[PDB]
């Protein structure tokens, strides 16, 4: 879906499989966190479905030793003195010592400030211990978390449930047309993006000889040249668009290992899984009622949450019993208007827009005479190939960007019995729609319930309307205070700040690095996990936020600003929390998840409609839903569901006929599935018979 998804997938630790265990053989104990996973496996990133705990992600600093156990690094403490000596320990090796938590106060020389320090001890025992007892200590605070997990700002303020959801949904981010790095980061974005491998890094230092949208040539210092080709509009495994763009320009000096071109969900080499949106935390006329989301049509107009999706369509021409299927533009009983977009071969041409149902590849297959309906044979007499063209499935639409044709006639090695093969690539440019699913990094998820016009949005003092409106009620229940903090810092990063340096450094910012006391608008910052911005420093920064271009400070030191109802004009009675939050477009879009069926295929054996949108199937009326029906006492609806609307071979046909005729719905027949049941019970030497009220067996 996006580079982070691939990276995590490559760093997965699965318990299932041969030699391991079966899913039916995994108790509540294999799955829950173990004290030995510290620094080795992440206790956050794990599915919440039936595979919870069976699939972990490797911790950040974890490595594997040649024996197979997962080693993690620790700093050796000599005599109450922290050393830069780093040794990797296994689990049982670690248990034979005592290690201190990363965030222990340390002297500039190495000695511990407090005599008592937090310490982990054998068997997963946590307690305080004298400074003279510490053998090793943690490398970094973020030593226990996964790559994804370490990308959650203010993670230390989110509950494990919403944090799991956030780390799992970051992997469902959809690459946007254009990618913006987040204002509020954690430091992991850079190395996540680079190590993910979907960007282009320079192997050796040099200068850029010639740069094009197609390729980038680097003239090394020694004299050699290396050319990196960009991957442009390539179809990902999951229909997301992988598209790399050059960053450097012609004649630019670039060092070894620098990012010269970044790919999807990347910006100057950092993971850009979403966009920075102006957020207002208030209820708004019920359109954001529990976890729904309201968006400004700006995001539609300026393609802010637009993303590309590429579908692959495929058809072949085989040898049949009565001849061979031929791909041809000449199709029986097809107007010249639908065939207008096809080339001479019956293949659609590049650049043609195609709706669902249009022809893409014209293939006709010869049908035998003994396979014709009596009405079909009459209609043939009263007026030998049938239509098997590749049509666009329902719900798909886009520009045809690429074609690929393989012909057994033209050397192309195909499976035996295949003469031609055509693959058509269709790209759709999906704007953000009602019902598309957005989410933040703290498991704060929702769907788009309303996209209002830019003038309706509650707008700030200087007229700038907000972009997204989050309901308040679904915030303090979930315990994802992260976003709150994230929001505030968000604003601080957009406007910047200037701390009052005169009369000394204020007492709250004493611990801040000197680089943070002044910041220009749209500044980039990092909240490292379990380190980073403390609430006090954030309070201060809200106190020293920069004014706008007109010299006005729009947000209060509490973090709230005054907004105006774009619909009535009156200002809203109270101040509202306004800020900037990083929102990601998750890969659960209505364009894919909508479906509907009148009629369609039926399984041969059971004669019940197929399943799945891709097979044009119907929804399943399960046992529980049947109990619901029986509860209401809707007898006729239940019967109609389980007969004429399903596997009543003659009843469904007569229903279709009665609908097109305008007549009444007929009387349901017997389900063919029950006939199947009877024949099976007979196959088990059980003599089942249906008796009439008189007692005679009926057939």
């Amino acid at each position: 879906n996006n580079p982070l998804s691939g990276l995590t997938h490559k760093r997965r630790l699965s318990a299932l499989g041969p030699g391991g265990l079966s899913r039916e053989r995994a108790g509540l104990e294999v799955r829950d966190v173990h004290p030995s996973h510290y620094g080795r496996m992440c206790p956050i990133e794990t599915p919440e479905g039936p595979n919870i705990g069976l699939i972990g992600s490797l911790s950040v600093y974890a490595r594997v030793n040649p024996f197979g156990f997962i080693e993690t690094p620790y700093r050796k403490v000599v005599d109450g003195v922290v050393s830069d000596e780093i040794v990797y320990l296994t689990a049982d090796e670690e248990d034979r010592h005592v290690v201190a938590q990363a965030n222990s106060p340390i002297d500039a020389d190495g000695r511990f400030v407090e005599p008592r320090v937090l310490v982990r001890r054998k068997a997963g025992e946590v307690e305080y211990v004298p400074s003279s007892e510490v053998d090793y200590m943690d490398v970094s605070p973020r030593q226990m978390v996964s790559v994804a997990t370490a990308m959650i700002p203010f993670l230390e303020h989110d509950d494990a449930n919403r944090a799991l959801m956030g780390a799992n949904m970051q992997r469902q981010a959809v690459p946007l047309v254009r990618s913006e790095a987040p204002l509020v980061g954690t430091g992991m974005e850079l190395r996540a993006a680079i190590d993910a491998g979907d960007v282009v890094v320079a192997e050796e230092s040099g200068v850029i000889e010639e740069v094009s949208a197609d390729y980038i040539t680097v003239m090394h210092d020694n004299g050699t040249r290396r050319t990196y080709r960009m991957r442009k509009f390539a179809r990902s495994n999951h229909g997301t668009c992988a598209n790399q763009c050059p960053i450097v320009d012609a004649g630019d000096r670039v060092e070894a290992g620098q990012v010269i071109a970044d790919g999807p969900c990347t910006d100057d080499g950092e993971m850009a899984l979403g966009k920075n949106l102006l957020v207002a935390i208030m209820p708004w006329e019920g359109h954001n009622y529990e976890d729904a989301i309201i968006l400004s049509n700006r995001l539609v107009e300026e393609d802010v949450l637009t993303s590309i999706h590429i579908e692959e369509h495929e058809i072949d021409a085989r040898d049949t019993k009565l001849g061979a299927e031929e791909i041809t533009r000449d199709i029986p009983n097809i107007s010249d208007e639908v065939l207008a977009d096809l080339d001479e071969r019956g293949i659609v041409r590049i650049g043609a827009e195609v709706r669902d149902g249009d022809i893409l590849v014209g293939k006709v297959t010869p049908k035998g005479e003994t396979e014709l309906t009596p009405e079909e044979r009459l209609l043939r007499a009263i007026f030998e190939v049938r239509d098997t063209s590749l049509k666009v499935p329902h719900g798909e639409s886009g520009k045809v960007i690429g074609i690929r044709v393989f012909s057994r006639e033209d050397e192309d090695e195909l499976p035996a019995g295949v003469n031609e093969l055509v693959r058509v690539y269709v790209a759709q440019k999906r704007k953000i729609s009602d019902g598309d699913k957005l989410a933040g990094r703290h498991g704060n998820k929702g769907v788009i319930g309303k996209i209002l016009p830019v003038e309706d949005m509650p707008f700030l003092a200087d007229g700038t309307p907000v972009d997204i409106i989050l309901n308040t009620h679904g915030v303090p229940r979930r315990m994802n205070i992260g976003q709150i903090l994230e929001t505030h810092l968000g604003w601080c990063a957009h406007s910047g700040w200037k701390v009052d340096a005169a009369k000394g450094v204020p007492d709250w910012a004493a611990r801040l690095p000197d680089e943070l006391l002044e910041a220009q608008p749209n500044a980039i910052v990092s909240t490292p996990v379990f380190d980073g911005a403390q609430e006090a420093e954030l309070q201060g920064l809200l106190s020293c936020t920069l004014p706008n271009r007109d010299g006005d400070v729009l947000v209060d030191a509490d973090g709230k600003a005054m907004l105006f109802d774009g619909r009535s004009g009156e200002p809203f009675p109270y101040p509202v929390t306004v800020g900037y939050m990083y929102i990601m477009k998750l890969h659960h879009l209505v364009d894919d998840k909508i479906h509907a069926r009148s009629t369609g295929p039926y399984s041969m054996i059971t004669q019940q409609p197929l399943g799945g949108k891709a097979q044009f199937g119907g929804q399943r009326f399960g046992e529980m839903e049947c109990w619901a029906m029986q509860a209401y006492g809707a007898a006729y609806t239940l019967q109609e569901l389980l007969t004429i609307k399903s596997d009543d071979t003659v009843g469904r046909v007569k229903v279709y006929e009665a609908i097109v005729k305008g007549e009444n719905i007929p009387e349901p027949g017997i389900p063919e599935s029950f006939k199947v049941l009877l024949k099976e019970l007979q196959s088990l030497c059980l003599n089942v018979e249906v008796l009439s009220s008189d007692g005679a067996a009926i057939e």
Binding site: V60, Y61, P73, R75, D84, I86, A102, N103, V139, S140, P141, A181, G185, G187, M188, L190, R191, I194, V201, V254, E255, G257, Q258, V259, D268, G269, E270, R511, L512, P513, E515, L516, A519, A523, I524, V525, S526, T527, P528, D531, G532, A533, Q534, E537
Partner: peptide, 23 residues
């Protein structure tokens, strides 16, 4: 400064603890 190794954008960190080993 955060991630001062490849040539990346200067993202400033609220870091209080130093990184003795890079990822």
């Amino acid at each position: 400064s955060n991630n001062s190794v490849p040539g990346a954008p200067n993202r400033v960190s609220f870091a209080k603890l130093r990184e003795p080993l890079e990822v």
